[PDB]
């Protein structure tokens, strides 16, 4: 028969349990969006300690027994690898809307209509999207950096946007780059986040060069150097144990001292081979031993070992240098320059080598002074939100106005088409349009001012045209137009909501059976 | 036939092999080639100096 | 309530127990977390390689006396390394190495006659094993010359000796028969026998 | 007693009963996946993983069961799916029905063998019939016999709602894969069409690749990540450092060649890289990886490699690109060398991020045309939905390219049996007809359990099926009322070649078969003995 401990149900019980975890989940973070935003905190299961407002961040910090809830998570994480921010909104949107799917497939309902009503509804406000976008020159300064602070509104950290918003600008052209002179890359990982504890934030800044955490490796080297010579390795300096074994037997009277003059004669001759093309700076991610140093101390050069891949990497297209394997393949091409400042200063109890670009860099890395790890985490998940936005604006030179005055928008232009439409479908359609207006109501909670009056007041402007722009001002909790606020929000980014939360909806509505306790195979 | 303690088919050999369009098939039990050699009439080769067309078959 | 009741007068019912067994088990998982960064400085003996990735402060006093344990460690591992290739005595100096043949060193006192595939593939997997554990005494022989008349139905016998005692017996290709034996399944039966620290998967 | 101590016995019509009691059970489980529309059901590991499924016999691989009879229909159904792929879910339903039936039947006290060898009549007739006469043209179809067939077969499925835009998609990386593999016969096979996810953007703009993708990233950055112009050379040899083997030993006496041999072993490898390079290759992927020495003469040649190939990519990918295999430098003579007869050439080569992460494409080989698709997927689990959904459609597809004949999918075909097979077991003296009629009978679960998944009225529905079959085949003029199945959304009975509801015939004709061993097998079993455990 069936095995023992597998427990199978079915009916209504499970699209109960699943509605009723879709809306626990979208009651747990509904307080955080918007300038009125209210900081989170929570513990991981291993025992740290984090603080943060943004969705996925932190939903990938609970542990659940039913599915449905891994599976928002999953879409959690989707949208934070898609858009990096307004994650909470696509959540609590799928969330609404599938409550108000619930009243509906009590109602005699089966959801092979509610999955085509899903697809009409969302190609029909996805087209009425594309008629209300306008696309904005990207050119302007000052248009980036209000988007920047837009976004950042709803963290707590816009105090220092003045300055820190326009940080985050520069790494996104500095980082800046196409390969061969095509397919534009801005690669995040060429943009290394590094944080010293410690300093106020107004310190804390891009830097147009490289960062590392690393010193000097010989007392009677140079510590500060204008232009020196750039030049990577990927070999070691120290003796090569070859592949095979050999064993040698000394059979003569003296071959041991042979053997070290070999040795030291090999090093000698790879050392001067690099020192060939005079450089000034010679750094590896390999160990090296004293002997390598000791020549190069005659050619005065840096001798720094031991950095990190990725780092190679990074400092590599800062500097536009090439890198080698072999002393005797080194050339003259691969030799870059662009060092326009070099130091070694102490920071804090902790060196720190400050290579300062004077070319054009192609990556960037930060400077993160902070007072804790965990708010450094925080600036640098929200800067990161920072780039993610401006590259794509770049990629996409649209906007719609923010304040979530768009989803109204839609909403009254997804009414009239189903005033439009016959079917009997148009009852979901509508209900879930008017799903999308939760954003509102949970803004006017953040700010616990009158709902009602205002939310109908809003109702009734969008209905006609000259007001889709006007929004929600949730600064004092009052209407104002958008035109002048400067919340602005791209395309793609509700674009990818809306898509998110729909297909998330349509996955979780159409399960019939359970099946539990069953052993992989 | 099947070996053990030593590949019976070599790559550099099987590389030849695909070069000179010849099927290639090893690790064959060591009883049952008597019933090939009652099946199809061949006889075994333990060496390339035995080598000649009397241990050799032929099908269609 | 009624319950609770009883439980303060009496024990009747049982449904206050085995509450703790659960929180000693977390109890100890929680502990055993702290081994992993007990001994990180402690196991690895390429730590003095790996410069600019393990060095925070050097106080020259428990670590350099780490180099003074490792060195003598590595030395005595490395005195013993002195075979590597399975060797053919004869019968006639038997008796002076089933009993002289040192205490402390284990001796894997190997029989058979060649021909077979099975004792081939067990001398091959032992030459092999040579190569990896030149500590371990190996010997191979013919075992006519070793036991008069001995059965030919009893090979490859494994035998595993030291002072004289037998430790473990690996009697025929009963326990070892099939091509299908391989280097690592050897290597675990010797381990099974006590003279090897090693891992495998089955 | 029988002296069959230590275990337990059983016998009677009871343990017959009991052979329909597991069967029977695992019918109700898998009652709502039927064919063009149905429901997906939950599955969670002990471990907790997430998994959807929508087909019987892939959501029963997973699950544990017992009464190894179970393992019959089990394995009967992964027959079925490694035969078709579609249909394979119904197998189990008819099997269970008809072991109930024959039970009763017994329970009149019929001899065995007289419902075995009627229902071995039976199903070859059915068989003979299915292929005579209840088949709708394709052949004849271009184009849209595709789509037709691929809708409904995703149709249970969760992306018909776009699935058209999906079933072109998938379709079309096909119907350009035309090669003679047999020399006199092209045939499509399948894994020639890669399949890789991607829970980025949304899935209504899945992609098709007009060429060929793979999951490889390159070495280093300074390596170029994108070339416009490409010369291929692929190698099953791993490059690394130089050892030559164990069965060679190296001793010297004078020390004076460390050095020597010390840069010989690398000359050998940089050598032979000088000897690819020179000849101009810039795409090279070897199955084992490859030194960063080596990929550093590459940046400075300015070529691009990529290690850690797997095998069979290697291999489709010289087969598309017109590269060619090799796994030594070794030629025609001992001396190695190298040759440019293996330049696999395409047109560009772009190491695309698509969500996070990037991966090697391949455009317009020089040397033929390939395809791959990379879906579109929400979360990973939709995504595993997605890609067995559409690895089925492959497997159902390749079915219609072999069999140009299709029978109206759905369960139509079911009552169209029923009534044929009713009209026959009356010809003949036989009392085994009963048995023989059953089959029919049997036949009526399928479309019916449909509209009780969809809520309708399946009795009067089939009646009026049944009733068009009937008149058909007694009226064979009217025999075109077997153009007439039932519509799930609805419950109309209504043309069913009209909407475009498709299966191949080979679907129906194995089932019978497959339901029928396994079912002569199963009922055979009226009697048990065990034995205790260890």
Same mark, same amino acid.
């Given at each position: 028969?069936?095995? @023992?401990?597998?427990?199978?149900?079915?009916?209504?019980?499970?699209?109960?349990?699943?509605?009723?975890?879709?809306?626990?989940?979208?009651?747990?973070?509904?307080?955080?969006?918007?300038?009125?935003?209210?900081?989170?905190?929570?513990?991981?299961?291993?025992?740290?300690?984090?603080?943060?407002?943004?969705?996925?961040?932190?939903?990938?910090?609970?542990?659940?027994?039913?599915?449905?809830?891994?599976?928002?998570?999953?879409?959690?994480?989707?949208?934070?690898?898609?858009?990096?921010?307004?994650?909470?909104?696509?959540?609590?949107?799928?969330?609404?809307?599938?409550?108000?799917?619930?009243?509906?497939?009590?109602?005699?309902?089966?959801?092979?209509?509610?999955?085509?009503?899903?697809?009409?509804?969302?190609?029909?406000?996805?087209?009425?999207?594309?008629?209300?976008?306008?696309?904005?020159?990207?050119?302007?300064?000052?248009?980036?950096?209000?988007?920047?602070?837009?976004?950042?509104?709803?963290?707590?950290?816009?105090?220092?946007?003045?300055?820190?918003?326009?940080?985050?600008?520069?790494?996104?052209?500095?980082?800046?780059?196409?390969?061969?002179?095509?397919?534009?890359?801005?690669?995040?990982?060429?943009?290394?986040?590094?944080?010293?504890?410690?300093?106020?934030?107004?310190?804390?800044?891009?830097?147009?060069?490289?960062?590392?955490?690393?010193?000097?490796?010989?007392?009677?080297?140079?510590?500060?150097?204008?232009?020196?010579?750039?030049?990577?390795?990927?070999?070691?300096?120290?003796?090569?144990?070859?592949?095979?074994?050999?064993?040698?037997?000394?059979?003569?009277?003296?071959?041991?001292?042979?053997?070290? @003059?070999?040795?030291?004669?090999?090093?000698?001759?790879?050392?001067?081979?690099?020192?060939?093309?005079?450089?000034?700076?010679?750094?590896?991610?390999?160990?090296?031993?004293?002997?390598?140093?000791?020549?190069?101390?005659?050619?005065?050069?840096?001798?720094?070992?031991?950095?990190?891949?990725?780092?190679?990497?990074?400092?590599?297209?800062?500097?536009?240098?090439?890198?080698?394997?072999?002393?005797?393949?080194?050339?003259?091409?691969?030799?870059?320059?662009?060092?326009?400042?070099?130091?070694?200063?102490?920071?804090?109890?902790?060196?720190?080598?400050?290579?300062?670009?004077?070319?054009?860099?192609?990556?960037?890395?930060?400077?993160?002074?902070?007072?804790?790890?965990?708010?450094?985490?925080?600036?640098?998940?929200?800067?990161?939100?920072?780039?993610?936005?401006?590259?794509?604006?770049?990629?996409?030179?649209?906007?719609?106005?923010?304040?979530?005055?768009?989803?109204?928008?839609?909403?009254?232009?997804?009414?009239?088409?189903?005033?439009?439409?016959?079917?009997?479908?148009?009852?979901?359609?509508?209900?879930?349009?008017?799903?999308?207006?939760?954003?509102?109501?949970?803004?006017?909670?953040?700010?616990?001012?009158?709902?009602?009056?205002?939310?109908?007041?809003?109702?009734?402007?969008?209905?006609?045209?000259?007001?889709?722009?006007?929004?929600?001002?949730?600064?004092?909790?009052?209407?104002?137009?958008?035109?002048?606020?400067?919340?602005?929000?791209?395309?793609?980014?509700?674009?990818?909501?809306?898509?998110?939360?729909?297909?998330?909806?349509?996955?979780?509505?159409?399960?019939?059976?359970?099946?539990?306790?069953?052993?992989?195979? | 036939?099947?070996?053990?303690?030593?590949?019976?088919?070599?790559?550099?050999?099987?590389?030849?092999?695909?070069?000179?369009?010849?099927?290639?098939?090893?690790?064959?039990?060591?009883?049952?080639?008597?019933?090939?050699?009652?099946?199809?009439?061949?006889?075994?080769?333990?060496?390339?100096?035995?080598?000649?067309?009397?241990?050799?078959?032929?099908?269609? | 309530?009624?319950?609770?009741?009883?439980?303060?007068?009496?024990?009747? &019912? &049982?449904?206050?127990?085995?509450?703790?067994?659960?929180?000693?088990?977390?109890?100890?998982?929680?502990?055993?977390?702290?081994?992993?960064?007990?001994?990180?400085?402690?196991?690895?003996?390429?730590?003095?390689?790996?410069?600019?990735?393990?060095?925070?402060?050097?106080?020259?006093?428990?670590?350099?006396?780490?180099?003074?344990?490792?060195?003598?460690?590595?030395?005595?591992?490395?005195?013993?390394?002195?075979?590597?290739?399975?060797?053919?005595?004869?019968?006639?100096?038997?008796?002076?190495?089933?009993?002289?043949?040192?205490?402390?060193?284990?001796?894997?006192?190997?029989?058979?006659?060649?021909?077979?595939?099975?004792?081939?593939?067990?001398?091959?997997?032992?030459?092999?094993?040579?190569?990896?554990?030149?500590?371990?005494?190996?010997?191979?022989?013919?075992?006519?010359?070793?036991? &008069?008349?001995? &059965?030919?139905?009893?090979?490859?016998?494994?035998?595993?000796?030291?002072?004289?005692?037998?430790?473990?017996?690996?009697?025929?290709?009963?326990?070892?028969?099939?091509?299908?034996?391989?280097?690592?399944?050897?290597?675990?039966?010797?381990?099974?026998?006590?003279?090897?620290?090693?891992?495998?998967?089955? | =007693?029988?002296?069959?101590?230590?275990?337990?016995?059983?016998?009677?019509?009871?343990?017959?009963?009991?052979?329909?009691?597991?069967?029977?059970?695992?019918?109700?489980?898998?009652?709502?996946?039927?064919?063009?529309?149905?429901?997906?059901?939950?599955?969670?590991?002990?471990?907790?993983?997430?998994?959807?499924?929508?087909?019987?016999?892939?959501?029963?691989?997973?699950?544990?069961?017992?009464?190894?009879?179970?393992?019959?229909?089990?394995?009967?159904?992964?027959?079925?799916?490694?035969?078709?792929?579609?249909?394979?879910?119904?197998?189990?339903?008819?099997?269970?029905?008809?072991?109930?039936?024959?039970?009763?039947?017994?329970?009149?006290?019929?001899?065995?063998?007289?419902?075995?060898?009627?229902?071995?009549?039976?199903?070859?007739?059915?068989?003979?019939?299915?292929?005579?006469?209840?088949?709708?043209?394709?052949?004849?179809?271009?184009?849209?016999?595709?789509?037709?067939?691929?809708?409904?077969?995703?149709?249970?499925?969760?992306?018909?709602?776009?699935?058209?835009?999906?079933?072109?998609?998938?379709?079309?990386?096909?119907?350009?894969?035309?090669?003679?593999?047999?020399?006199?016969?092209?045939?499509?096979?399948?894994?020639?069409?890669?399949?890789?996810?991607?829970?980025?953007?949304?899935?209504?703009?899945?992609?098709?690749?007009?060429?060929?993708?793979?999951?490889?990233?390159?070495?280093?950055?300074?390596?170029?990540?994108?070339?416009?112009?490409?010369?291929?050379?692929?190698?099953?040899?791993?490059?690394?450092?130089?050892?030559?083997?164990?069965?060679?030993?190296?001793?010297?006496?004078?020390?004076?060649?460390?050095?020597?041999?010390?840069?010989?072993?690398?000359?050998?490898?940089?050598?032979?890289?000088?000897?690819?390079?020179?000849?101009?290759?810039?795409?090279?992927?070897?199955?084992?990886?490859?030194?960063?020495?080596?990929?550093?003469?590459?940046?400075?040649?300015?070529?691009?490699?990529?290690?850690?190939?797997?095998?069979?990519?290697?291999?489709?990918?010289?087969?598309?690109?017109?590269?060619?295999?090799?796994?030594?430098?070794?030629?025609?003579?001992?001396?190695?060398?190298?040759?440019?007869?293996?330049?696999?050439?395409?047109?560009?080569?772009?190491?695309?991020?698509?969500?996070?992460?990037?991966?090697?494409?391949?455009?317009?080989?020089?040397?033929?045309?390939?395809?791959?698709?990379?879906?579109?997927?929400?979360?990973?689990?939709?995504?595993?939905?997605?890609?067995?959904?559409?690895?089925?459609?492959?497997?159902?597809?390749?079915?219609?390219?072999?069999?140009?004949?299709?029978?109206?999918?759905?369960?139509?075909?079911?009552?169209?049996?029923?009534?044929?097979?009713?009209?026959?077991?009356?010809?003949? =003296?036989?009392?085994?007809?009963?048995?023989?009629?059953?089959?029919?009978?049997?036949?009526?679960?399928?479309?019916?359990?449909?509209?009780?998944?969809?809520?309708?009225?399946?009795?009067?529905?089939?009646?009026?099926?049944?009733?068009?079959?009937?008149?058909?085949?007694?009226?064979?003029?009217?025999?075109?009322?077997?153009?007439?199945?039932?519509?799930?959304?609805?419950?109309?009975?209504?043309?069913?070649?009209?909407?475009?509801?498709?299966?191949?015939?080979?679907?129906?004709?194995?089932?019978?078969?497959?339901?029928?061993?396994?079912?002569?097998?199963?009922?055979?079993?009226?009697?048990?003995?065990?034995?205790?455990?260890?």
């Amino acid at each position: 028969v069936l095995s @023992q401990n597998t427990k199978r149900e079915s009916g209504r019980k499970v699209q109960s349990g699943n509605i009723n975890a879709a809306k626990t989940i979208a009651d747990i973070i509904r307080t955080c969006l918007g300038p009125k935003s209210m900081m989170k905190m929570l513990l991981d299961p291993m025992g740290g300690i984090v603080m943060t407002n943004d969705g996925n961040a932190i939903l990938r910090e609970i542990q659940v027994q039913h599915p449905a809830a891994k599976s928002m998570i999953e879409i959690s994480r989707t949208q934070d690898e898609e858009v990096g921010d307004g994650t909470t909104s696509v959540i609590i949107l799928a969330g609404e809307m599938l409550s108000v799917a619930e009243h509906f497939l009590e109602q005699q309902m089966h959801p092979t209509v509610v999955i085509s009503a899903y697809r009409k509804a969302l190609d029909d406000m996805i087209s009425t999207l594309k008629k209300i976008s306008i696309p904005v020159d990207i050119s302007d300064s000052d248009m980036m950096l209000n988007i920047i602070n837009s976004s950042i509104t709803t963290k707590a950290i816009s105090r220092w946007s003045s300055l820190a918003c326009n940080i985050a600008l520069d790494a996104v052209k500095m980082v800046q780059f196409e390969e061969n002179g095509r397919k534009e890359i801005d690669i995040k990982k060429y943009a290394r986040v590094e944080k010293i504890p410690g300093g106020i934030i107004e310190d804390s800044c891009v830097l147009r060069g490289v960062m590392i955490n690393k010193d000097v490796t010989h007392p009677r080297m140079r510590r500060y150097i204008k232009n020196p010579r750039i030049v990577l390795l990927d070999s070691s300096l120290e003796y090569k144990k070859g592949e095979s074994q050999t064993d040698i037997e000394i059979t003569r009277e003296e071959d041991f001292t042979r053997i070290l @003059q070999m040795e030291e004669e090999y090093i000698q001759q790879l050392c001067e081979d690099i020192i060939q093309l005079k450089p000034d700076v010679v750094i590896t991610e390999k160990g090296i031993s004293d002997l390598a140093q000791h020549y190069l101390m005659r050619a005065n050069i840096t001798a720094i070992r031991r950095v990190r891949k990725t780092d190679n990497n990074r400092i590599a297209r800062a500097c536009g240098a090439r890198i080698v394997s072999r002393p005797e393949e080194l050339r003259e091409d691969d030799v870059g320059t662009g060092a326009g400042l070099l130091e070694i200063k102490k920071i804090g109890d902790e060196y720190f080598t400050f290579i300062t670009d004077c070319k054009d860099p192609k990556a960037c890395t930060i400077l993160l002074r902070g007072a804790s790890k965990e708010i450094l985490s925080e600036v640098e998940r929200n800067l990161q939100d920072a780039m993610q936005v401006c590259r794509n604006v770049l990629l996409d030179p649209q906007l719609v106005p923010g304040g979530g005055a768009s989803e109204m928008a839609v909403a009254h232009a997804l009414t009239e088409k189903s005033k439009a439409m016959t079917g009997v479908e148009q009852w979901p359609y509508r209900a879930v349009a008017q799903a999308l207006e939760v954003i509102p109501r949970t803004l006017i909670q953040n700010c616990g001012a009158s709902t009602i009056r205002l939310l109908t007041s809003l109702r009734a402007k969008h209905t006609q045209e000259n007001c889709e722009t006007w929004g929600v001002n949730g600064e004092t909790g009052t209407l104002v137009d958008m035109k002048e606020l400067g919340i602005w929000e791209p395309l793609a980014v509700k674009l990818q909501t809306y898509k998110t939360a729909v297909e998330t909806a349509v996955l979780l509505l159409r399960i019939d059976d359970i099946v539990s306790g069953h052993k992989k195979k | 036939q099947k070996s053990i303690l030593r590949d019976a088919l070599s790559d550099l050999a099987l590389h030849f092999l695909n070069k000179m369009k010849i099927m290639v098939i090893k690790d064959i039990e060591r009883e049952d080639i008597e019933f090939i050699c009652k099946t199809i009439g061949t006889k075994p080769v333990a060496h390339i100096d035995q080598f000649t067309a009397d241990m050799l078959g032929s099908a269609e | 309530e009624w319950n609770d009741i009883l439980r303060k007068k009496g024990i009747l &019912p &049982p449904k206050e127990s085995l509450k703790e067994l659960e929180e000693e088990a977390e109890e100890e998982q929680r502990i055993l977390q702290q081994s992993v960064v007990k001994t990180y400085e402690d196991m690895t003996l390429e730590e003095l390689e790996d410069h600019e990735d393990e060095f925070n402060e050097e106080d020259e006093r428990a670590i350099e006396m780490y180099r003074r344990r490792r060195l003598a460690e590595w030395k005595a591992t490395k005195l013993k390394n002195k075979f590597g290739e399975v060797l053919e005595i004869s019968g006639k100096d038997y008796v002076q190495e089933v009993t002289k043949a040192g205490e402390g060193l284990w001796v894997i006192l190997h029989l058979y006659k060649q021909g077979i595939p099975l004792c081939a593939l067990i001398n091959q997997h032992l030459s092999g094993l040579a190569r990896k554990f030149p500590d371990v005494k190996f010997i191979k022989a013919i075992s006519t010359t070793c036991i &008069p008349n001995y &059965p030919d139905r009893n090979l490859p016998t494994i035998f595993v000796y030291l002072e004289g005692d037998i430790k473990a017996q690996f009697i025929g290709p009963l326990v070892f028969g099939g091509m299908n034996l391989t280097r690592d399944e050897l290597e675990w039966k010797l381990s099974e026998s006590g003279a090897i620290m090693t891992d495998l998967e089955e | =007693g029988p002296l069959s101590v230590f275990g337990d016995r059983s016998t009677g019509e009871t343990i017959r009963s009991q052979n329909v009691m597991a069967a029977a059970s695992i019918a109700n489980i898998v009652k709502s996946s039927l064919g063009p529309v149905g429901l997906d059901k939950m599955l969670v590991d002990d471990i907790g993983d997430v998994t959807i499924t929508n087909d019987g016999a892939t959501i029963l691989k997973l699950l544990e069961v017992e009464h190894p009879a179970a393992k019959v229909l089990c394995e009967l159904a992964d027959l079925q799916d490694k035969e078709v792929g579609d249909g394979t879910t119904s197998v189990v339903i008819i099997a269970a029905e008809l072991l109930k039936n024959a039970d009763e039947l017994v329970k009149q006290k019929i001899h065995p063998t007289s419902v075995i060898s009627g229902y071995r009549l039976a199903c070859k007739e059915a068989v003979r019939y299915i292929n005579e006469n209840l088949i709708v043209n394709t052949d004849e179809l271009g184009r849209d016999c595709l789509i037709n067939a691929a809708k409904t077969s995703m149709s249970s499925k969760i992306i018909g709602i776009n699935g058209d835009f999906f079933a072109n998609m998938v379709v079309d990386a096909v119907l350009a894969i035309k090669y003679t593999d047999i020399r006199g016969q092209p045939r499509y096979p399948v894994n020639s069409v890669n399949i890789l996810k991607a829970h980025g953007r949304s899935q209504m703009e899945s992609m098709l690749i007009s060429g060929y993708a793979l999951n490889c990233v390159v070495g280093s950055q300074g390596m170029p990540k994108r070339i416009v112009n490409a010369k291929i050379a692929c190698l099953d040899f791993s490059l690394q450092k130089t050892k030559m083997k164990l069965g060679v030993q190296v001793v010297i006496t004078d020390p004076e060649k460390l050095d020597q041999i010390r840069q010989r072993e690398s000359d050998i490898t940089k050598e032979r890289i000088q000897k690819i390079l020179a000849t101009g290759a810039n795409v090279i992927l070897t199955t084992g990886g490859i030194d960063d020495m080596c990929l550093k003469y590459f940046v400075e040649a300015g070529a691009m490699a990529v290690r850690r190939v797997l095998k069979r990519d290697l291999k489709r990918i010289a087969k598309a690109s017109g590269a060619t295999i090799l796994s030594t430098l070794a030629n025609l003579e001992g001396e190695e060398t190298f040759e440019a007869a293996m330049l696999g050439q395409a047109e560009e080569v772009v190491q695309e991020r698509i969500c996070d992460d990037e991966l090697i494409l391949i455009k317009n080989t020089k040397a033929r045309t390939s395809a791959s698709i990379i879906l579109r997927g929400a979360n990973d689990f939709m995504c595993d939905e997605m890609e067995r959904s559409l690895h089925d459609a492959l497997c159902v597809v390749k079915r219609v390219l072999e069999s140009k004949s299709v029978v109206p999918g759905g369960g139509a075909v079911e009552a169209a049996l029923s009534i044929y097979l009713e009209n026959y077991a009356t010809s003949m =003296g036989s009392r085994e007809q009963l048995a023989i009629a059953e089959f029919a009978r049997s036949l009526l679960v399928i479309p019916n359990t449909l509209a009780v998944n969809a809520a309708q009225d399946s009795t009067d529905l089939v009646a009026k099926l049944r009733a068009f079959h009937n008149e058909a085949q007694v009226n064979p003029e009217r025999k075109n009322l077997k153009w007439i199945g039932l519509d799930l959304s609805n419950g109309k009975p209504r043309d069913n070649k009209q909407a475009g509801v498709f299966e191949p015939t080979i679907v129906k004709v194995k089932s019978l078969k497959f339901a029928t061993e396994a079912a002569i097998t199963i009922l055979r079993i009226d009697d048990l003995i065990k034995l205790h455990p260890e």
